[PDB]
Amino acid sequence: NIGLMKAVDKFEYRRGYKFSTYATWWIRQAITRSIADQARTIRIPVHMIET
DNA sequence: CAAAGGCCGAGGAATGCGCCCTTTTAGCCTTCTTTTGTCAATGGATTTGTG
């Protein structure tokens, strides 16, 4: 929901794409950073988790 | 006039999961100035030598 608020703040309909097609990016990024930041007890940085 | 079936939705495992790029932040790594511990001199005030 936080990520979706962020995407809603950035949506421009001048292009004509669906809102889903844009906001899905910010939503999935928000959720992924959330899991990578606050899911392990010992916090691994995000790039190391990608590795 | 009902039945089969095509459709949609409400609910779950999981073989499920970002990338490329800019920008700050930590920390290690060298270089230098200063406080500190050390070696040698160099007299100088008790300790002993003397009769």
Estimate the helix proportion, in percent: 55-70%
Distance between the termini: 27 Å
**Total number of β-strand segments?**
0
Major sheet, described briefly?
A: none
Query: What is the alpha-carbon Rg in Å?
Result: 14 Å
Category from helices, strands and their pairing: mainly alpha
Task: State the shape.
Answer: elongated
Strand percentage: under 5%
Helix-strand sequence: HHH
Q: Please count the helical segments.
A: 3
Question: Which helices and strands occur, and which strands form pairs?
Answer:
Elements: H1 2-10, H2 19-38, H3 46-50
Helix pairs in contact: 1-2
The chain binds one DNA strand of 51 nucleotides through helix 2.
Explained architecture:
The protein has 51 residues and is mainly α. The chain has three helices and no strands. Helix 1 runs antiparallel to helix 2. The longest helix is centred in the middle third of the chain and has 20 residues, at 19-38. It is elongated, with a radius of gyration of 14 Å. The two termini are 27 Å apart. The relative contact order is 0.16. It binds one DNA strand of 51 nucleotides through residues 28-29, 32, 35-36, 49-50. It is classed as transcription/dna. The entry lists the keywords transcription, transcription-dna complex. Escherichia coli RNA polymerase promoter unwinding intermediate (TRPi1.5b) with TraR and mutant rpsT P2 promoter.
Compact summary:
The PDB classes it as transcription/dna. With 51 residues, the chain is an all-alpha fold.
